[PDB]
Design a protein around this ligand. Structure first.
Ligand SMILES: *[C@@H]1O[C@H](CO)[C@@H](O)[C@H](O)[C@H]1NC(C)=O
Ligand SMILES: *[C@@H]1O[C@H](CO)[C@@H](O)[C@H](O)[C@H]1NC(C)=O
Ligand SMILES: [Ca+2]
Ligand SMILES: [Ca+2]
Length: 108
């Protein structure tokens, strides 16, 4: 039966300041195929606190990148996927930012 729905791999980032590079994130389903066939990524209240969604070509991961030069640490991003649809709701995959240039660094 297709019970569960899609979910992001890492739940906490360490973005950088000056020019953060894409925060790689992926997807996982508890179901058995077809039930986990391809997706549809969606961003809920903050679909713009600047956050822009993306899929890897070979299916599984998603590319998460801002679109604003935003602030000094601690804040989430509401995520939302689907697989037959099922639609999950995912959620918050918070984001810890600390001073910088462009590579995902160890934080503070
Ligand atoms: C503590 O809670 C805040 C509020 O969401 C969060 O930003 C932070 O990452 C949590 N832990 C630490 C060590 O900051
Ligand atoms: C993410 O950080 C916020 C800000 O403190 C916190 O309220 C939340 O519980 C953390 N994680 C999730 C999944 O919401
Ligand atoms: Ca099942
Ligand atoms: Ca499923």
């Amino acid at each position: 039966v297709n019970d569960n729905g899609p979910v992001p791999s890492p739940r906490v980032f360490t973005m950088c300041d000056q020019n953060p590079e894409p925060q790689v994130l992926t997807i996982s389903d508890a179901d058995i195929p077809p039930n986990t066939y391809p997706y549809k990524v969606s961003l809920s209240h903050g679909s713009d606190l600047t956050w822009k969604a993306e899929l890897d070509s070979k299916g599984t991961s998603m590319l998460l990148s801002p679109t604003q030069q935003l602030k000094k640490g601690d804040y989430s991003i509401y995520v939302l996927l689907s697989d037959a649809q099922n639609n999950p709701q995912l959620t918050v995959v918070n984001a810890t930012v600390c001073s910088c240039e462009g590579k995902a660094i160890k934080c503070q």
